[PDB]
Amino acid sequence: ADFEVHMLNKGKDGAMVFEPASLKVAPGDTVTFIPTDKGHNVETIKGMIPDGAEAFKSKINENYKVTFTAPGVYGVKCTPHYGMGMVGVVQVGDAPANLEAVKGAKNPKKAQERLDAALAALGN
Numbered sequence: 448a449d450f451e452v453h454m455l456n457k458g459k460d461g462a463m464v465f466e467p468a469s470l471k472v473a474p475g476d477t478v479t480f481i482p483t484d485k486g487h488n489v490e491t492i493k494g495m496i497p498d499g500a501e502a503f504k505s506k507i508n509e510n511y512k513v514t515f516t517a518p519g520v521y522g523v524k525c526t527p528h529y530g531m532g533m534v535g536v537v538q539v540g541d542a543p544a545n546l547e548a549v550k551g552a553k554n555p556k557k558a559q560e561r562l563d564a565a566l567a568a569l570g571n
């Protein structure tokens with residue numbers, strides 16, 4: 448299954464957002480992060496990727512397709528707008544084993560507000 452996440456300057460949740468900001472996919476599914484607005488990328492957040500997965504970082508303005516392999520919760524950010532809260536969460540598969548350690552990861556205040564909302568949106 449293929450899903451799309453749009454990178455926008457402004458959306459329903461305020462400035463600098465990924466829409467949707469919370470998504471659940473199956474192990475092996477692909478998500479394309481689309482630069483609807485220019486000046487954004489996607490990068491995994493330190494401490495917010497499961498065991499066996501590798502970190503990734505796309506280039507500014509590229510349409511970036513990612514096939515999620517390792518099951519778990521992945522926190523993603525937009526590099527330049529991380530301090531402004533441009534973040535999202537991708538849950539891969541059921542019963543993520545790192546969900547509890549992703550909740551304790553440290554992020555700038557605006558990003559933490561949005562991550563907490565996104566994490567609660569998946570059933571915590």
Ligand SMILES: [Cu+2]
Nearest residue numbers: 487525528533
């Ligand atoms: Cu951005």
